[PDB]
Design a protein around this ligand. Structure first.
Ligand SMILES: CC(C)(COP(=O)(O)OP(=O)(O)OC[C@H]1O[C@@H](n2cnc3c(N)ncnc32)[C@H](O)[C@@H]1OP(=O)(O)O)[C@@H](O)C(=O)NCCC(=O)NCCS
Ligand SMILES: [Zn+2]
Length: 185
């Protein structure tokens, strides 16, 4: 396979390692990290998530990269691209998502990771568009989407189809950025 690593000024976006699973599990168990998600995850659930990531990298050659901070930390979380195949109005497409350990918030690291992942999406993969979705309360998350230059149509708000019809977290907002908008920043 030989999954290609992506480099920013500060960040290394790399394939996941066994050593990552411990660090990622405490992130998944952190109520500040998982605040706008349905719940925190146990070790088994966190490992399942990593298995899905590795399987995504095996099939597609890209995925949510593990974020390394050379000269500081081996693992501060993930940022990158996931294929959207679920039954939503904007499928099929590619989504960008991110999760940082709280110690690394407020540093522009999610921004830098996301810019590196989108550079890849538009320059190497040459995708027409990348989406991002989150819940309205998760201001840190859609705050990053709009600072990245992604734009929301409130009319494109949707109920996540892999949650229950009456799930309290069901309502998601959609941000989009196309090759043209990304190149124009
Ligand atoms: C969503 C999340 C990744 C955002 O991370 P973040 O660190 O807030 O985002 P950025 O990398 O853009 O950093 C922005 C902050 O750094 C500051 N900053 C400092 N130096 C900066 C730099 N060089 N570049 C950019 N921002 C910089 C900005 O002013 C801003 O400060 P503020 O948040 O207090 O206003 C993070 O809150 C998180 O992991 N949350 C939990 C997981 C989650 O919900 N993910 C979304 C799933 S839908
Ligand atoms: Zn959600």
């Amino acid at each position: 396979s030989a999954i290609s690593e992506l480099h920013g000024p500060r960040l290394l976006l790399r394939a996941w390692r066994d050593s990552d699973r411990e660090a990622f599990a405490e992130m998944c168990a952190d109520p500040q990290v998982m605040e706008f998600f349905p719940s925190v995850l146990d070790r088994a659930q966190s490992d399942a998530l990593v298995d899905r990531v590795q399987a995504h990298f095996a099939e597609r050659g890209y995925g949510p990269w593990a974020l390394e901070l050379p000269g500081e930390a081996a693992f501060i979380g993930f940022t990158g691209l996931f294929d959207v195949t679920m039954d939503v109005h904007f499928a099929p497409t590619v989504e960008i998502g991110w999760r940082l350990a709280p110690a690394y918030w407020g540093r522009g690291l999610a921004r830098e990771a996301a810019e590196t992942a989108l550079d890849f999406a538009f320059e190497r993969l040459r995708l027409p568009e990348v989406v991002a979705f989150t819940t309205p309360p998760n201001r840190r998350s859609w705050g990053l989407m709009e600072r990245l230059g992604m734009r929301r149509d409130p009319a494109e708000d949707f109920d996540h189809p892999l949650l229950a019809a009456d799930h309290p977290m069901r309502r998601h907002i959609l941000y989009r950025v196309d090759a043209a908008r990304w190149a124009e920043r």
